[PDB]
Write a protein that binds this ligand. Structure first.
Ligand SMILES: Nc1ncnc2c1ncn2[C@@H]1O[C@H](COP(=O)(O)OP(=O)(O)O)[C@@H](O)[C@H]1O
Lengths: 601, 267
DNA sequence: ATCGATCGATCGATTTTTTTTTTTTT
DNA sequence: TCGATCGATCGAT
């Protein structure tokens, strides 16, 4: 038989990796060591290592794959048996990788079978789990039915003659759903590649399959690097017919690199609370004790920008923490909060935020007037695909525990916006007309992008008439910090000499003091702290608010207060410290008063 | 058997040995509480089982069908023996469970969860109405005119009053027992989604004591057990055998609780 | 002379889809 | 018109 050569080859492959595999070290047993407890039946292998040590089994492996394929499960079994008290439960999942050649849909013919070639595309119209009792037990009905046979075949067939007796061969025994083989997969389609964009023809569709451990770690909207194990697939085909039949095309693949959709959260190789959550103690110790850290942080993300220096100290607000405290079932207590921007025409209103989406993860930005009023709700459908009314999504709600800001905050219809009138505080939204008593939840902050009425700031009218909209909304936005335009040559020449160091291709920016990665990781470490309040400011904020409204004794009240204590508990999160202090108070009070007197005429 | 008898016997030495709530344990009296009201839906605590005899977690999954059956025999041989007048109304029993240390979200269960203990929740959608079923195998012989006798599988023995003859047969519309039936469509809540995609779903079967309890558009809690339709026409196949999935209902808890509800402490 | 395998006469079992008129919402 | 059913038949033993 063919594959005995592959048996001996992977035998001595085992026998080598039985010893070291790499410099007295092993990279293909410790996966098996983690496997050894649950026995999940996967161990992926590099194909490059086949090119390292086994000396070109590619042309041994890469053409007659399918017939060699099952022998490698027995290879895997002969591996796992060598050291563990072993039953034949062992099985073969594979997630092949490290293969150089990466081709497309078009280089496909009848000569391309039993290979491992690599392909990409996009994910569409995906389909669910769909189990399979692939196996069981089946023979005659007298006594001798214990059949561990090959009945897992694609075309499935009850009929088996016998093992022990001479008996019927058309009367089956019944089936086994108890002590048998079952497995799991799913099924999708994939469209023509966007990395391979030809003209003319359609997006030719491919059928495509995944195994169990491959399942449900793909998703819509992703580009891939798969296996190439095209297969024989078990009207209008009016060719000649024989027998001692008209097939279509199909395909499967057993390896995934679902890249371009991966961040990984937070895990200086040192000791810490967790593995790598803040292993950079060596520097984060300094990043939590410096006294000018506030300004050094302020100027650490806007070197390519120059304007006011007041939201370069505030907007860290939005990315910064809230509370996350331990309370009873009174109600939701909230952590993050609004911000607003208005400004004259294009003082870089948009480049603040066009980048911020690229800055932190989970927080994708766009506008909703890019589409219908399906920003809040999903696309309202009234034709039959499954049950004639399917609205369970949107675009605003695609930012859960992250932000999704807007541009052109003013010209948007008062449906999404009147829904925003509630959706930001009692952060639970509902609808009718297609809702299975619709109960959603958004959670997150916002950033505004208003534009005045006439496109100028002529102080002839109150702010609430400088915009002349509906009112109550302009309180829950707890800070505005408007950018002003003037006419002074010094500023604009400073801007042009920013462009002096945007394209002078060597050293086309200014020096810095703090790099970004350390900043972001310090930020994502600063949340998990369980802050504390035991401070006389906590006792003595009553007079601070009373003084605030002594100034307001000449809109009003305690929404702003809620903000206040959260702005300042955030600015103490910035001190990498629990145990609230009475100075973050005074800064927050100053920010409050800047906002209100900025609102003042 | 020796050991395989001890299950019901431990239930017997459970319902009058394990005690909470300062004496007069519930199941001493919960069962008669329920035989009074003619309900026939007795319910079990799992945590109480862990408090008394933790043995009943490993002995169960190998065939929980048989566990539940060996449960119901005990309720029968208790109630209909101690209330012999009872054998008029329903004359059948089964039990319920409402304490499981796990809530398995949807889109989380696979072939590993086959035919064993479950907990899951979600939301109802459109399903069927209310229909009855069969319960017993009885025919009417057609050659000799007798009845074959009482007996998802057929039996058809050759033994019968007709000189163990008459392979042929016919059937009446009476003298055989029936069973109420209903279906459900379990979809997951639009809160705990993967944030904006289609949802997943399974079908579920519930049985005769449990009907006109659910409703379209409701909150849900079910133990359930994972089914396996034994064949969706195994043959020359697709790129997949046409196989399917259900869960079978043991016990529901609703989350709204729109009735007079809570059981009662002793003091 | 007993018995299993193959041939062949005998039996019963399958064959329904593309427009319209109300209806909810943008 | 297609399929298994059942009963008969021809060499082996
Ligand atoms: N202080 C500043 N720093 C950097 N760029 C600035 C500054 N002031 C103005 N600009 C320029 O103003 C432009 C604003 O364009 P933008 O407001 O994004 O257009 P739109 O209003 O259509 O969104 C930016 O492209 C930027 O080059």
């Amino acid at each position: 038989v063919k594959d005995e050569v592959g048996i001996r080859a992977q035998k001595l492959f085992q026998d080598f990796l039985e010893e070291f595999k790499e410099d007295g070290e092993i990279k293909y047993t410790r996966p098996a060591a983690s496997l050894e407890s649950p026995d999940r039946c996967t161990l992926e292998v590099s194909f490059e290592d086949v090119e390292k040590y086994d000396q070109n089994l590619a042309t041994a492996i890469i053409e007659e794959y399918y017939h060699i394929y099952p022998f490698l499960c027995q290879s895997v079994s002969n591996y796992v048996k060598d050291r563990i008290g072993l039953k034949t439960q062992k099985d073969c999942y594979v997630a092949f990788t490290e293969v150089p050649t990466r081709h497309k849909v078009r280089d496909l013919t009848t000569s391309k079978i039993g290979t491992l070639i690599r392909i990409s595309g996009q994910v569409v119209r995906t389909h669910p789990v769909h189990p399979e009792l692939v196996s069981g037990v089946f023979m005659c009905l007298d006594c001798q039915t214990e059949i561990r046979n090959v009945e897992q075949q694609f075309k499935f067939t009850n009929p088996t003659i016998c093992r022990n007796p001479v008996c019927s061969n058309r009367k089956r025994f019944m089936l086994d759903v108890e002590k048998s083989l079952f497995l799991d997969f799913q099924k999708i389609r994939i469209q023509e590649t966007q990395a391979e964009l030809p003209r003319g023809c359609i997006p030719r569709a491919v059928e495509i399959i995944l195994r169990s451990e491959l399942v449900e770690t793909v998703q819509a909207g992703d580009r891939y690097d798969f296996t190439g194990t095209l297969i024989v697939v078990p009207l209008a085909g009016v060719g000649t017919r024989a027998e001692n039949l008209n097939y279509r095309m199909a395909f499967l693949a057993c390896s995934v690199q679902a890249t371009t959709a991966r961040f990984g959260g937070t895990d200086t190789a040192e000791d810490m609370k967790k593995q790598m959550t803040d292993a950079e103690w060596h520097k984060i110790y300094e990043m939590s004790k410096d006294r000018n850290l506030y300004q050094n942080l302020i100027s650490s993300l806007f070197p390519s920008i120059y304007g006011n220096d007041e939201v370069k100290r505030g907007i860290l607000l939005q990315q910064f923490g809230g509370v996350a405290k331990t309370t009873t079932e009174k109600t939701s207590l909230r952590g993050d909060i609004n911000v607003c921007i208005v400004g004259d025409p294009s003082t870089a209103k948009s480049q603040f935020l066009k980048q911020v989406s690229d800055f932190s993860p989970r927080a994708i930005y766009t506008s909703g007037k890019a589409s219908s009023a399906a920003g809040l709700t999903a696309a309202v459908v009234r034709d039959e695909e499954s049950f004639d009314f399917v609205i369970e999504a949107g675009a605003l709600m695609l930012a859960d525990n992250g932000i999704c800001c807007i541009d052109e905050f003013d010209k948007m219809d008062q449906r999404d916006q009147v829904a925003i009138h509630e959706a930001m505080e009692q952060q639970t939204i509902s609808i009718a007309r297609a809702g299975v008593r619709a109960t959603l939840n958004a959670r997150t902050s916002i950033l505004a992008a208003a534009n005045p009425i006439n496109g100028r700031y002529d102080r002839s009218k109150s702010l609430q008439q400088n915009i002349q909209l509906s009112a109550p909304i302009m309180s829950r936005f707890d800070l505005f910090f408007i950018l002003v335009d003037e006419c002074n040559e010094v500023v604009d020449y400073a801007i042009a000499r920013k462009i002096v160091d945007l394209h002078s291709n060597i050293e086309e920016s200014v020096e810095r003091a703090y790099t970004r990665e350390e900043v972001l990781r310090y930020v994502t470490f600063a949340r998990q702290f369980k802050p504390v309040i035991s401070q006389e400011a906590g006792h003595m904020l009553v007079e601070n608010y009373g003084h605030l409204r002594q100034r307001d004794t000449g809109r009003i009240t305690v929404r702003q207060l809620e903000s206040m204590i959260r702005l300042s508990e955030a600015m103490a999160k910035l001190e990498c410290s629990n145990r609230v202090l009475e100075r973050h108070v005074k800064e927050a009070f100053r920010l409050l008063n800047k906002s209100i007197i900025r609102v003042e005429q | 058997l020796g050991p395989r008898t001890e299950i019901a016997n431990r239930f017997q030495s459970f319902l009058r040995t394990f005690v909470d709530e300062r004496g007069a344990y519930t199941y001493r009296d919960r069962i008669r509480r329920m035989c009074e009201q003619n309900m026939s839906s007795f319910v079990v605590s799992y945590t109480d089982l862990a408090n008394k005899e933790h043995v009943l977690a490993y002995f169960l999954p190998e065939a929980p069908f048989q566990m539940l059956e060996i449960f119901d025999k005990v309720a029968k041989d208790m109630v209909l023996s101690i209330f012999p007048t009872y054998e008029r109304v329903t004359t059948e029993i089964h039990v319920r469970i409402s304490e499981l240390p796990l809530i398995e979200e949807l889109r989380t269960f696979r072939k590993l969860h086959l035919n064993q203990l479950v907990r899951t929740l979600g939301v109802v959608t459109a399903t069927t109405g209310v229909l009855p079923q069969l319960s017993v195998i009885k025919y009417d012989c057609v050659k000799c005119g007798y009845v074959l006798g009482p007996f998802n599988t057929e039996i058809k023995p050759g033994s019968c009053p007709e000189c163990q003859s008459t392979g042929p047969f016919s059937i009446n519309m009476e003298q055989t027992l029936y069973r109420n039936y209903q279906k459900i469509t379990l979809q997951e809540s639009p809160g705990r989604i993967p944030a904006g995609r289609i949802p997943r779903s399974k079908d579920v079967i519930l049985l005769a004591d449990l009907c006109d309890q659910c409703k379209p558009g409701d909150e849900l809690e079910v133990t359930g057990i994972y089914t396996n339709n034994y064949d969706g026409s195994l043959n020359t196949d697709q790129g997949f055998p046409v196989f399917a999935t259900v869960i079978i209902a043991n016990h529901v808890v609703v989350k709204d609780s729109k009735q007079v509800v809570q059981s009662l402490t002793d003091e």
